[PDB]
mmCIF file of C-alpha atoms in Angstrom:
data_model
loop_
_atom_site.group_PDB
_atom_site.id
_atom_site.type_symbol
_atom_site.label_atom_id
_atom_site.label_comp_id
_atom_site.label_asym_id
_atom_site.label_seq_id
_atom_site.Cartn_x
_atom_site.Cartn_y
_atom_site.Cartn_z
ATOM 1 C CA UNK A 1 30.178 -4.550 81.638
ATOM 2 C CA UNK A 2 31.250 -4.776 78.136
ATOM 3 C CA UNK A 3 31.375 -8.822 76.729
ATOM 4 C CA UNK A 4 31.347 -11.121 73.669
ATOM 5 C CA UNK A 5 28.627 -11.828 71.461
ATOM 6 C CA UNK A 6 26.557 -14.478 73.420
ATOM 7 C CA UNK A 7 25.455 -17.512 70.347
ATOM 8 C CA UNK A 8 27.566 -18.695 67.517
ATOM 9 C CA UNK A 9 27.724 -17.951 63.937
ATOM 10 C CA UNK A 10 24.818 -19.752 62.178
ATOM 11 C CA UNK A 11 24.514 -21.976 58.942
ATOM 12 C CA UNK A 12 28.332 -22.877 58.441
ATOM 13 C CA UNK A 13 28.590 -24.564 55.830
ATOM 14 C CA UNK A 14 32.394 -26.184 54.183
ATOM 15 C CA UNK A 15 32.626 -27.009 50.534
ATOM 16 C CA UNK A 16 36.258 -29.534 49.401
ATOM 17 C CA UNK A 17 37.075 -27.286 46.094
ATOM 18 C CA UNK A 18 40.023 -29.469 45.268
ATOM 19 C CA UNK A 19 43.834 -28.507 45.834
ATOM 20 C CA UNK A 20 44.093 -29.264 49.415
ATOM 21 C CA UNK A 21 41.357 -26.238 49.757
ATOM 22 C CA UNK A 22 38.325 -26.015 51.729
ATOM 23 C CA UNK A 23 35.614 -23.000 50.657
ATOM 24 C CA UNK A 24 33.632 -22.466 54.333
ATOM 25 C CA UNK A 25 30.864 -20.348 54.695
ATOM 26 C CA UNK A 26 28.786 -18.831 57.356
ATOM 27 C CA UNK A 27 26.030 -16.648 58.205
ATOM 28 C CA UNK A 28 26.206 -13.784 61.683
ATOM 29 C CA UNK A 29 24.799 -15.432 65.167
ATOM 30 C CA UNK A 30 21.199 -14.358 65.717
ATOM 31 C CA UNK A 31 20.721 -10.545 65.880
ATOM 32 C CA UNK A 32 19.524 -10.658 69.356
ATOM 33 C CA UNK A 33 22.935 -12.780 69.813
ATOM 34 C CA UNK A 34 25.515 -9.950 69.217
ATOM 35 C CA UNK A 35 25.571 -7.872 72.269
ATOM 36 C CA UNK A 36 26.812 -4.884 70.477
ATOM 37 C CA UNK A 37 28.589 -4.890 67.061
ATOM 38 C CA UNK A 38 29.904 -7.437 65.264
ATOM 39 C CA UNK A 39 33.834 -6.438 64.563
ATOM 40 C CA UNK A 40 34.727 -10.071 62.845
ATOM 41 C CA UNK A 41 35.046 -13.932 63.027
ATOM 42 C CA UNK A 42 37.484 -16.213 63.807
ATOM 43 C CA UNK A 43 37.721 -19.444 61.900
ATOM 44 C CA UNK A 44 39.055 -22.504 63.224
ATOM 45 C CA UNK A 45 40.116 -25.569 61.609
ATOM 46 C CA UNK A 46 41.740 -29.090 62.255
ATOM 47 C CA UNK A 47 42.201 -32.899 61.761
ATOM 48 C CA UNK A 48 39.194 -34.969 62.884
ATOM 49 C CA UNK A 49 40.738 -37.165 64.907
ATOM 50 C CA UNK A 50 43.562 -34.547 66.514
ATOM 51 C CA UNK A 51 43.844 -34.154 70.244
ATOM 52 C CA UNK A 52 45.301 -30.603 69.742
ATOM 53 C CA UNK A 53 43.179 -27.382 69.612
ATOM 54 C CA UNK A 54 41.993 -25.652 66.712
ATOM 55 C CA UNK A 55 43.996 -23.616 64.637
ATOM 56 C CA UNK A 56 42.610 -19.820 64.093
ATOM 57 C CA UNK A 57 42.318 -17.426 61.671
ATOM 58 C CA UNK A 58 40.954 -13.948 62.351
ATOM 59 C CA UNK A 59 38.728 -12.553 59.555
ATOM 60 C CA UNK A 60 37.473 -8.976 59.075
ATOM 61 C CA UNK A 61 33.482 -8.709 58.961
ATOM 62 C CA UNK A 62 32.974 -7.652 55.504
ATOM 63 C CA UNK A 63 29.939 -6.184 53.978
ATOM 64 C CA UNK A 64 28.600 -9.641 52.315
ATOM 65 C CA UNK A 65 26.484 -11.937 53.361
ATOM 66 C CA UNK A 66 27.559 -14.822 53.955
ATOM 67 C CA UNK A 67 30.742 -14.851 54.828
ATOM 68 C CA UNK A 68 33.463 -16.759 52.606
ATOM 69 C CA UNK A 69 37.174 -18.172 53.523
ATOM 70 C CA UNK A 70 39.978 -20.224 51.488
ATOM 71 C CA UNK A 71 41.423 -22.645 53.784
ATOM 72 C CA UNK A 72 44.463 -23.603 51.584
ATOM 73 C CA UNK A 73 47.508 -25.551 52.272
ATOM 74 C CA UNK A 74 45.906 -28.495 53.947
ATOM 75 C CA UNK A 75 47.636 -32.126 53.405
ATOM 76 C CA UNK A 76 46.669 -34.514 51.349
ATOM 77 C CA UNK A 77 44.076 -37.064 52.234
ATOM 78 C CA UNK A 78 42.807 -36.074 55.608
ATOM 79 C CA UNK A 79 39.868 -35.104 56.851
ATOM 80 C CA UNK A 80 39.180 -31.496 58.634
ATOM 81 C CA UNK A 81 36.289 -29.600 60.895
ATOM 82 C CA UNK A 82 35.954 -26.095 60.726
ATOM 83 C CA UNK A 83 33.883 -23.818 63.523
ATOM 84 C CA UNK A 84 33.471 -20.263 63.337
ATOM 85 C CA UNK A 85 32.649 -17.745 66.382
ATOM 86 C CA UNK A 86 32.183 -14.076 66.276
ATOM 87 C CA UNK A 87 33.981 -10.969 67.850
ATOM 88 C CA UNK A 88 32.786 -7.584 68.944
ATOM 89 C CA UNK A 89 35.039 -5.293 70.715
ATOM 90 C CA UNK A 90 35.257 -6.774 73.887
ATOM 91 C CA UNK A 91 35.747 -10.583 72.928
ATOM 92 C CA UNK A 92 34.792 -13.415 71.115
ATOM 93 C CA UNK A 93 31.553 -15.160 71.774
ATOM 94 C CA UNK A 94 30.650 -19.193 71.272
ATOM 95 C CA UNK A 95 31.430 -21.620 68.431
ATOM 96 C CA UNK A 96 29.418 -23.073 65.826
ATOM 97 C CA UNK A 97 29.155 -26.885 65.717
ATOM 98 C CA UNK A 98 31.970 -28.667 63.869
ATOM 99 C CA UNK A 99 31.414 -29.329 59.947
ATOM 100 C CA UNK A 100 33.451 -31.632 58.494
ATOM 101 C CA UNK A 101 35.089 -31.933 54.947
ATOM 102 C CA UNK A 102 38.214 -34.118 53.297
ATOM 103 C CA UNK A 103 40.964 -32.439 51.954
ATOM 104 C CA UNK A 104 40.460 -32.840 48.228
ATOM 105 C CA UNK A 105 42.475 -33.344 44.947
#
């Protein structure tokens, strides 16, 4: 039947922009990847060296390429990975690779 896209988000990239912000940015899984339309992403974040799970944010596909979030709010003086994944209508599909950025000043 009807199921998520089946590879991840490509060429995520995070940029520290100071203010406890991080600027991420990714591209849409392989064409042949998206088993149907792409709806959206959800970004996930976290500390490094935390045992809990990611935190999510759901993010409307928009029409640019790539895509852009603010991750804002972080603490001070840690250290974060972000992974992305991509949703059709039936679900979300597999994550990116972590990339891995401090939380700058």
């Amino acid at each position: 039947g009807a199921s998520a896209p089946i590879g991840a988000p490509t060429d995520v990239n995070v940029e520290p922009i100071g203010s406890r912000t991080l600027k991420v940015t990714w591209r849409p899984p392989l064409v042949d990847h998206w088993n149907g339309i792409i709806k959206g992403y959800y970004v996930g974040h976290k500390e490094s060296d935390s045992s809990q799970q990611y935190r999510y944010q759901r993010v409307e596909r928009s029409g640019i390429n790539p895509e852009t979030l603010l991750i804002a709010g972080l603490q001070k003086a840690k250290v974060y990975n972000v992974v992305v994944k991509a949703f059709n209508t039936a679900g979300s599909g597999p994550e990116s690779h972590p990339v891995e950025a401090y939380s700058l000043e």
